[PDB]
Structure formats: C-alpha cells, structure tokens
Amino acid sequence: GAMAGVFTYETEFTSVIPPPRLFKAFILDADNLIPKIAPQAVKCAEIIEGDGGVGTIKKITFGEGSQFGSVTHKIDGIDKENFVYSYSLIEGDALSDKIEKISYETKLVSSSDGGSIIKSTSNYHTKGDVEIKEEHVKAGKEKASHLFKLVEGYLLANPNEYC
C-alpha cells in the first residue's frame, strides 16, 4: 500500500486577551460568537452528532466571504484547564486523494504581560508522494488571522461578556 505520513506545521500569534476569556469566547462559543459578529465568514455551525464534547461531528457553513462553502470537523479533544482544543477536518476543500485528514490543535498559552500566545498545529495525514505547497498552507494561516482580529475587537468592545 501507499506511504502514510504526517506533515506538521506550527504557527503562533499573540493576543491582549488572556487564555480563560479567549478560550471561552473564541474556542468554546465559536458556533454562536462568529456567526453573530462575522456573518460573511460563518453563516452557521450545526452539530451533526454528539453534544459538544470529544467525538462530536459538526458542519460549519461559511458566509459570502467563502462562497457559502463548508467544513466538517470531528472533536478530538478539549482541555478546559490547559486551554487546548483538538479537532480533525473530515470533509473540506483542503482534503484530497493526497491529504485524507488534517488534525488540528489550538493551544492558548498565557504570558506574564496579561495576554495570550495562540499556538496552532496543522497535522496533514498524507498518502503517497508528498507535495505540500507553502502558498496553499499559508492561505489557511492568513485565513484564521483576519478573522481572529474581528473576535479580539468584539471582546475588547464588550468586556462584560465571557467572564
């Protein structure tokens, strides 16, 4: 059979919002928060199976900004105490004959200046010859970035929320 491998890519960015509020809002309430503040980004998020914990399958339908496309995610793990959230891409444009799955990890690490470091790990499950383009990968890193700034901007404007 064809060669199975994992291509791992790691990216980091900072936030003025510390991990508890940021993980509660940006991670745990993404289904409610993002459609509400960025409808052009996320139209809706519907749970296909499960209740919200590990093993939950959910479809995220994009707004006009992503031509009303969609992704299907499986929740691999949630650590509310360590601000870690793992999920896999089980249906999406990023998948192909070459890339059968993409496992993701988002970790919120605190800093002594009262903020967060948002560490994102992308694990591509490859089949056969590996041909991962830097432009294709960075388009997903760029993607997540422009949206987080809408989230950050809203949390700063609404301090009473997610306390």
Side-chain angles (χ1 to χ4, degrees), residues 54-90 92-140 143-148 150:
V54 187
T56 293
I57 292 163
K58 65 167 86 197
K59 192 166 103 173
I60 302 161
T61 302
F62 300 137
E64 199 148 278
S66 280
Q67 302 78 57
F68 307 97
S70 69
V71 290
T72 305
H73 292 168
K74 192 201 158 65
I75 302 199
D76 302 337
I78 305 167
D79 203 309
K80 288 177 186 197
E81 304 294 326
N82 299 334
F83 324 101
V84 190
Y85 176 74
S86 347
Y87 62 97
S88 298
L89 183 64
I90 63 157
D93 278 348
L95 305 185
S96 64
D97 308 75
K98 289 218 164 192
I99 310 293
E100 52 192 26
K101 198 177 74 186
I102 321 176
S103 307
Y104 299 98
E105 188 172 271
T106 309
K107 266 194 80 168
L108 302 196
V109 170
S110 80
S111 39
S112 59
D113 58 3
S116 291
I117 308 88
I118 303 97
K119 295 169 129 185
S120 317
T121 316
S122 282
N123 299 289
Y124 296 79
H125 297 265
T126 59
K127 267 269 147 73
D129 301 299
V130 187
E131 279 154 50
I132 295 163
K133 279 99 184 68
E134 178 176 36
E135 181 281 330
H136 204 249
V137 167
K138 271 167 182 180
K143 193 267 154 291
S145 297
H146 353 112
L147 175 66
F148 182 89
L150 296 155

Side-chain angles (χ1 to χ4, degrees), residues 43-57:
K43 183 168 176 171
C44 69
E46 62 216 334
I47 291 152
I48 286 157
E49 63 173 86
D51 50 336
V54 187
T56 293
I57 292 163

